[PDB]
Write an enzyme that holds these catalytic residues in place. Structure first.
Site, PDB file in Angstrom:
ATOM      1  CG  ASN A 147      32.301 106.055  99.831  1.00  0.00           C
ATOM      2  OD1 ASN A 147      32.466 107.339  99.651  1.00  0.00           O
ATOM      3  ND2 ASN A 147      32.592 104.980  99.049  1.00  0.00           N
TER       4      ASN A 147
ATOM      5  CD  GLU B 299      40.629 113.996 101.548  1.00  0.00           C
ATOM      6  OE1 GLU B 299      39.738 114.035 100.801  1.00  0.00           O
ATOM      7  OE2 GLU B 299      41.329 113.088 101.722  1.00  0.00           O
TER       8      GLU B 299
ATOM      9  CB  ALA C 255      33.895 103.141 110.664  1.00  0.00           C
ATOM     10  CG  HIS C 256      35.878 104.321 103.589  1.00  0.00           C
ATOM     11  ND1 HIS C 256      35.460 103.438 102.134  1.00  0.00           N
ATOM     12  CD2 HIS C 256      35.629 105.543 102.965  1.00  0.00           C
ATOM     13  CE1 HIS C 256      35.467 104.201 101.218  1.00  0.00           C
ATOM     14  NE2 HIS C 256      35.348 105.500 101.620  1.00  0.00           N
TER      15      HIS C 256
ATOM     16  CD  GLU D 143      38.469 117.207  99.007  1.00  0.00           C
ATOM     17  OE1 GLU D 143      37.300 117.403  99.677  1.00  0.00           O
ATOM     18  OE2 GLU D 143      39.217 116.245  98.646  1.00  0.00           O
TER      19      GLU D 143
ATOM     20  CD  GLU E 252      36.560 111.725 105.658  1.00  0.00           C
ATOM     21  OE1 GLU E 252      37.043 110.724 104.976  1.00  0.00           O
ATOM     22  OE2 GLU E 252      36.582 113.064 105.024  1.00  0.00           O
TER      23      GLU E 252
HETATM   24 NA    NA Z   1      34.371 108.064  98.124  1.00  0.00          NA
END
Ligand code: NA
Ligand code: NA
Ligand code: NA
Ligand code: NA
Lengths: 206, 206
Positions: free
Chosen positions: A193, A50, A128-129, A5, A126
């Site tokens: 989270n 990312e 529905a944080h 990453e 990813e």
């Molecule tokens: Na985070």
């Protein structure tokens, strides 16, 4: 998922588009596949997370497809539908609302399936944080997943809060986040989270 | 659009799947293309309307594609996505709600674009049935048309009410529909589906 990453680079693919970092990146992909390829529970390889889209991503995708054709490869970076992924795997694409960023637009999941030429399944890497009191609108995703055959689900962000235990002056433990250890700069409560607390007690969103 | 509709047959393709009616049907398609092929305003051929899907439809589609490749051919019958059409052209498919009939399901327009294998544009040959005080939900179609690139619009049903003028005992004209001429059986006010009255005065839906 390979241990790659490079989110902090500007632009995000400054290393992953560079051939002098292709040896380093290749070791992180090839040694993961060599260690884990016999496990039946592993059904998908990931190239990391990312890191934009660079030529090294396309090379390492084709390496995995050659060495292990029994598992699809996915990768989100550079807009989640590049040639380095077999699955359209966006992060935080919404069900009905488009998010038209410049080079990396996050289209509505339903719209993304029908764009001209697109034929791949869509699984959100990813969505529905779950930061704190969250998961509003979660039923909208699952209505869409059941209705659309090429919408095959996704992976919620995320399982457990990343908080650490500190102790007060009387030795009572308390959950700490970001700058609670003198670390600066930091990003405060954004490490937490999870659907569950760090001691695995469930949040109400679970 | 060719002058072929066999809606009253049971099933709807009882004639159009029959080779003994292939000469009749072929005359209605081939003589239309021969008459009208020089007109620039004609951009799409249609094989008729509400006649199921038969082998004669596939034959006449391939005839038109051979003789005149400059215009796409469409046809709604047998589920609006058969091999007899270049355009997915359903009637009264809704924007978000599916209508799962047995052999001919009317999927949501947005869902229909992403079904596996489907790559054609979608243009509704009939939608927003303007019978009387109607056209509720018309803005939902046009939001969907603008957002989705392969949703390229549709054709409203329909332009003008099919009413006829009768005269009372003092000679005052009045607009008549279905069984107003002693015709039995009839289908009453269902001939009047227009955006405009029969004298071309607009309804409020226009
Ligand atoms: Na985070
Ligand atoms: Na699905
Ligand atoms: Na469009
Ligand atoms: Na009618």
């Amino acid at each position: 998922e390979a241990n790659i990453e490079t989110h902090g680079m500007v632009p995000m693919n400054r290393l992953t588009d560079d051939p002098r970092w292709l040896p380093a990146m290749s070791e992180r992909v090839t040694r993961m596949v060599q260690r884990d390829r016999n496990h039946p529970s592993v059904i998908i390889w990931s190239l990391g997370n990312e890191s934009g889209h660079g030529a090294n991503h396309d090379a390492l995708y084709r390496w995995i497809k050659s060495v292990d054709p029994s598992r699809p490869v996915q990768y989100e970076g550079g807009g989640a539908d590049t040639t380095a992924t077999d699955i359209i795997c966006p992060m935080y694409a919404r069900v009905d609302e488009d998010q038209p960023f410049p080079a990396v637009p996050k289209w509505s999941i339903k719209k993304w399936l029908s764009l001209p030429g697109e034929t791949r399944p869509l699984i959100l890497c990813e969505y529905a944080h779950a930061m704190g009191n969250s998961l509003g609108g979660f039923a909208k995703y699952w209505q869409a997943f059941r209705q659309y055959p090429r919408l095959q689900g996704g992976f919620v962000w995320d399982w457990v809060d990343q908080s650490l235990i500190k102790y007060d002056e009387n030795g009572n433990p308390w959950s700490a986040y970001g700058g609670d250890f003198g670390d600066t700069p930091n990003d405060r409560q954004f490490c937490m989270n999870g659907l569950v607390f760090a001691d695995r007690t469930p949040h109400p969103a679970l």
